[PDB]
Amino acid sequence: WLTSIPWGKYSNENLDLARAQAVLEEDHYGMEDVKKRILEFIAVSQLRGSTQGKILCFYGPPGVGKTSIARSIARALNREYFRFSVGGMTDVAEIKGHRRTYVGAMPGKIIQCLKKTKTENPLILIDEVDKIGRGYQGDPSSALLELLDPEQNANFLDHYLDVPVDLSKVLFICTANVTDTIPEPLRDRMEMINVSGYVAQEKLAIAERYLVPQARALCGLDESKAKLSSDVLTLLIKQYCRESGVRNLQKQVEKVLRKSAYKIVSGEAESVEVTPENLQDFVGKPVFTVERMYDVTPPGVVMGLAWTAMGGSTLFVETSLRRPQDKDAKGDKDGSLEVTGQLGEVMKESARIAYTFARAFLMQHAPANDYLVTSHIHLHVPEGATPKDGPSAGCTIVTALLSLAMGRPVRQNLAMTGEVSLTGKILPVGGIKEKTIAAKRAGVTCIVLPAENKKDFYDLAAFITEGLEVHFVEHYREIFDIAFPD
Amino acid sequence: GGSTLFVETSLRRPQDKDAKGDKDGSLEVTGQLGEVMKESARIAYTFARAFLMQHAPANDYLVTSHIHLHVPEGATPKDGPSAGCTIVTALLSLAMGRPVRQNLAMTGEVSLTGKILPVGGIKEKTIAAKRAGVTCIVLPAENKKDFYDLAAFITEGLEVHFVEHYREIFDIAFPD
Amino acid sequence: WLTSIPWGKYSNENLDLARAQAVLEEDHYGMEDVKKRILEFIAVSQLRGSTQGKILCFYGPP
Amino acid sequence: GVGKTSIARSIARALNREYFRFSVGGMTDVAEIKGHRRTYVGAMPGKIIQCLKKTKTENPLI
């Protein structure tokens, strides 16, 4: 075990920027930030000699190409590759081996990585960093810190092998679908890159240039026998697949290619020209026949954008009058409110703040409207949004409560996300790009965002912001003139 | 497999504690309820209340009455919320007393407003209903393909009913 | 234990689809999805040559 | 991000006494400070023991 380890053996690293740039572009679509960061890394390493190894993490929805882009980076840089599923782990021993006192004790897994790669400047991937239990007899995060410290990593040693080994030239990648649960000490030490979903156009491009040939090769097929139209892929994306990722699209394309291969072997068509008419037999029938859960937004229900752990979503904040408005015409009782959605205490406080603001705003605008003051109401804000992004539904909550008070439905194909501050001031929120792609995928044409988030919508591409009559606000009153124009 | 579970509702307390009383008609739920299913039961409760208020405003039963509902267990938590429609119709029947139409089954999630979402186990629930001997089955519209992907011999003897909103169901179980 | 292991020994695999389909229909009724999935697996393994191994689960009532 | 760790390093450099760091935050078990009983299979001493071994000094800067 000691001898098989490389010692001073550094894998030759690619340094030409154009070549690695082209490799990354041909192995992947989009991901401009990741490719630019790798180009900066190569430029630094070529401008400072020794092949330093920098740490970073890729945060984004699944089925986006994090493992694939890391593999492409290992390929382009010419350095080796090795991954590790840290998710749900509770035994640090595998990273440190043992004390050597066991029967044939093994070293740490990084020792195995160095042995297999045979070189001391490899690419290492860590998947499900956010899923670490860090429970009893575990706490591997500390070891991870020991690994990811810019200075301590240089003297890393194992329980099995107490000799130190340099981990400064080793490049580290980490992948997660959310940035909150990952430990803060581990969070700070490494930078954080956003690979954020795809719209139908990006998914179609990825499928036609990366998924279809890949699965044809997987199914032992050629570009002539199995033919898929871009229209077929678009229809599949719209109806057979509803998420920000690409994984389910991969499953469907693999299924159709499997059926095509079977039809070629035992069937009659030496080659197949897949079309939607034939897509029905190749896959089945549309699963998501509805673009949205609602299309008119009746009174008391409003669309909102949620930055759930898996990309973005178009949730529907709903309200109902759960008691007769007039128990006693003289009665000056409080219009109690019930809230559902598995809400935390911060969510409950935000709902209370939105309730107070809605009452005040009605009293300012419709003083005779005692509906909100005197009515027992129930609002359901669907869960799924991360707790940090949850308070972004206050704007929805307010407009939905107003609509219920006056009965005026919110404007159709309208989505919003923002945070109220007990007076109407709308604050910036996170997950702007995921929410934008969700709204685009849901048919939203008008979108309301805080002014402070304007940039996170303007830094987006142009083909991701077509038909979105954006509405940038700082105070809630403006929205009342948008959601309720008349 | 699948089963047919009879959701039950009872008035576990006197309706007229005080004629002028404006107290909430609280509801208790049995069936080893999880948090998600408890929230689904609450949502169905409020939806049924609002539905009565709209359809029968003079009916204060669901509002001024303390009720108990039991959903028989066996269903996995994922499929649990599918009984929201059953809960709503059971509460409505207890409110008006009109017994639900016989040989009628239903399953579908509710969204605090009556919109009905697709549910899983369509084939398994269909065979459970067929073995149970029903004729009218209510399913979400979005589940329709999952019911039409079944064989032909597996659907005779029942009149399927597809829906995307609960009002249609109120027009089915309570035709009169 | 080390020597008793089959090293490089691969059980000969049926590849014809008619006979396998008839066998599946003879030994069972229904399960059409499973039967056609096995047919597709055999077709893929035959087209690509080597007897590829694949993972799949059968979920249903006991 | 003010320079507490940096100025502790500077103090260790100036005094010439060795330096070592120990993150006690988010920590529950006392084992990492006092090791183990030496009887548990694969037992380890306290992290301070590792510090004393590494520094090769009796008066380092922890």
Numbering used by the authors:
A (entry chain B): 464 to 949
B (entry chain A): 774 to 949
C (entry chain A): 464 to 525
D (entry chain D): 526 to 587
Question: Which lines from the publication concern this structure?
Answer:
Other hLon mutants were produced by exchanging Tyr186 and Tyr394 for glutamates (Y186E; Y394E), thereby mimicking the negative charge introduced by phosphorylation (hereafter “phosphorylation-mimicking” hLon variants), or for phenylalanines (Y186F; Y394F), which acted as non-phosphorylatable controls (these mutations were introduced to verify that the effects of phosphorylation were not due to the loss of functionality occasioned by the removal of the Tyr hydroxyl group). The same approach was also used to study TFAM and the most significant digestion delay was observed in the reaction with Y186E, where more than half of the protein substrate remained undigested. In particular, Y186E is still able to degrade β-casein, but more slowly, while it loses the ability to degrade TFAM. The stimulation of the ATPase and peptidase activities for Y186E has been notably reduced to only 1.5–1.6 times the basal activity, while that of Y394E is still of the wild-type level, although its basal activity is lower. Overall, pCMF186 is similar to Y186E, but more extreme, while pCMF394 is qualitatively different from Y394E. Cryo-EM maps were obtained for Y186E, Y186F, pCMF186, Y394E, and Y394F with resolutions ranging from 2.9 to 8.5 Å (based on the 0.143 cut-off of the Fourier shell correlation curve). Tzeng et al. found that unfolded substrates interacted with the β-stranded subdomain through two hydrophobic patches, however Tyr186 is found on the opposite side of the domain from these patches, so the drop in proteolytic digestion exhibited by the Y186E and pCMF186 substitutions is unlikely to be due to direct interference with substrate binding. Tyr186 is, however, surrounded by negatively charged glutamate and aspartate residues from both subdomains, putting it in the middle of a large, negatively-charged patch.
